[PDB]
A and B are shown apart, each in its own frame.
Chain A
């Protein structure tokens, strides 16, 4: 869950259709993430937990590390 849900959301903001089309190993700026598009992840991520999360982790996978880590 902490992985495929990122594959199914980072595209919802990026606009890619296939969930697997996310090169989840490449930098966010290299994937093409804007200010609004970066923070749209943070504002839809806690939609169903708790600022600069996605500049702290410039990689979809390396941000997805932060799900089950501390529970």
Chain B
């Protein structure tokens, strides 16, 4: 190849009866024709290839008022939609192209909307009707600093545009480019003019190279291709849909009539472009004709091809024209042809060129060495195709393209909750469809994580195979600083962490380190595998305080390690009773050894106390229970202040009963009266354990359940603090208040049960992380992500060898916008 080959890494289109590349391959492969009569809602030659509707547009997605959208060319709107779709199909996140050198090259030659506007004025009409903005608008919404221009060579515009894009890439003027065109036949005056020119088929079909050839039928649509240099594309690991080897543009020059094409100019063009690509006639597997079905044009094009690519070739060169399917899109004819070729290169198949039955007597197919593709055959030998587009002013262009060289989460986002609904439904239908079944659920989750922008309305679905994930999407279709509250005694349940261990190796690794250290400590000083006690449903060993505190600590530390690997790094921490021990450890204050020693000593020294202790949850203000228990300090006290009207009374099982009966009040299933005078016997012993541990400055902001406020290191790193924490009331409500004060806007319950989360909701975005634990924790991280947190979903798929695969584009929230 002479110059840098340009890679096509993505594309998008709107074509009659084809809303996208999928639908387009459907129409072309079925050999179906999109040409119909002029729909009733249009105005009036009586045939054409028409889109479903042109008045719909999601003005909110792109930040467009209805005012501005109404005065906006539907061509400008459509190109916006096509740009976002083309980038998403390329796999690129548009946010990333902001302030880059992205180039925009659009071919357009018809201004029907502006004609409508003028045959019947506010400040938007200037921008809404001016052609230059078809490309320029894109550059402004993406924030591209590369060249932005609209080119008018007549019917050959769109193809020329790609040429100009290619050159602009080869020079380094642009690093990525979007290239294509648009043409919308919404005005009867343009139809009348092209009809009075006599070029229009009375039968409304383009009989390309067929003896019936009597003109073209009009079409409308639009199309884009994302272009990178082959070097840059391969380096960046992008999905290559094709490679342009060479492109060229010339003019007919001294034609017979201004509008008569020239055979010699066409031959010069073909020779130049194929020599530059270095492709012989035998290497060409197919040529996308201009193929308008004109009595004059078809013989000239056929003769040029037979002169350049017919001679020096054994088998007949297959040819065809998409204008037989959807019609003559004029300004946007070129791009359409290219997209067709591209889909044939990736599919490695050919599709029929319709409206062919007998060769034009002016076209000796046999001598010229060319055959019209009429059968959806496969494509044999890599594969190389060529595209032509000619303008009525004589500007001709040709392009040479070659073919290319356990539990899973799926994330969807959208700019509107109803948009989120539709995004989920679209993804589900596609996952069920064959095209989506050619991609694995792993690859799909990966690409959703890496190749899609994460809008402000997000959601995550979990599943083991395709069907689970699909039904999850179906069901779906129907901030501040981060704060962690670590659950305390009473949130434990049989089966803690058994299922977290089997799905996520990070939880398993952290849980094994903590459980090995804790196994050692509790084996030396027993109240020999904590793993076994926690994982066994047939085990009430967790309700005794000699196991519940180490169990909670292990569950929560491994859970914090796994949330941190998923990116979720808390900024303010707090804990209810034993919960603090986790929070202070993950804050970096205590090493794993000292923390395990602390928690096992606390649990063991509290386990050896006699019975007769009790705790009751009571719907009463702190003031009320202070009124009720005062004078009984030696026997009963406030165990915890969990809310403005929710406190736990702790004390002698005798004195606890009349408190419950007075307020009758839920009795708590605890082995001892924690945070009460009954905890005095183990205080001083505990005071020696803490005296032999190393406390460091926390790496995060810690809020004390004893103080009820932000505790400093000098206080947090003293023996007196922790003995008072083991003795006095847990001021959890005051702690929630203090965390809100420092700037927390998102609260997470690290641990089983949803107790602390209910308490935090009472005090006030509140999420209870966890409590099948693969599901129970993918849920935690999903609720975090949708709350506003930036979860590195990419790092989740590092275990599987996932690859990037094409995915359905954004489901636009379309509403009507028009004039009157």
Contact = CB atoms under 8 A, between A and B. Distances in A.
Interface of A: 29, 34-36
Interface string B174-216: 0000000000000000000000001000000000000000000
B529 interface: no
A36 B256 CA distance: 13
Contacts of B258: 34
A24 B198 CA distance: 28
Interface in B253-289: 256-260
A36 B197 CA distance: 9
Nearest to B259: A35
Most B CB within 10 A of own CB, among A29, A34, A35, A36: A35
Nearest to B258: A34
Nearest to B257: A35
Contacts of B256: 29
Interface string B317-330: 00000000000000
A34 B198 CA distance: 13
Contacts of B198: 36
Interface residues on B, range: under 10
Interface in B211-263: 256-260
Contacts of A29: 256
A14 to B, nearest CB: 15
A32 B198 CA distance: 19
Nearest to A38: B257
A36 B258 CA distance: 12
Contacts of A35: 257, 259-260
Nearest to B260: A35
Contacts of B259: 35
Most A CB within 10 A of own CB, among B198, B257, B258, B259: B257
B290 to A, nearest CB: 19
Nearest to A34: B257
Contacts of B260: 35
A6 B259 CA distance: 26
Nearest to A36: B198
7 contacts: A29-B256, A34-B257, A34-B258, A35-B257, A35-B259, A35-B260, A36-B198
A41 B514 CA distance: 100
Contacts of A34: 257-258
A34 B196 CA distance: 14
A35 B296 CA distance: 11
B362 to A, nearest CB: 15
Interface string B427-453: 000000000000000000000000000
A56 to B, nearest CB: 14
A34 to B, nearest CB: 6
A15 to B, nearest CB: 17
A36 B259 CA distance: 11
Nearest to A29: B256
B407 to A, nearest CB: 70
A42 B582 CA distance: 100
B762 to A, nearest CB: 86
A49 to B, nearest CB: 25
Nearest to B256: A29
Nearest to B196: A36
Nearest to A33: B257
A29 B198 CA distance: 20
A24 B259 CA distance: 25
A29 B254 CA distance: 12
A60 to B, nearest CB: 18
Contacts of A36: 198
B581 to A, nearest CB: 93
Interface string B701-736: 000000000000000000000000000000000000
A36 to B, nearest CB: 7
A18 B256 CA distance: 28
B193 to A, nearest CB: 14
B194 to A, nearest CB: 14
A36 B199 CA distance: 11
A3 B259 CA distance: 31
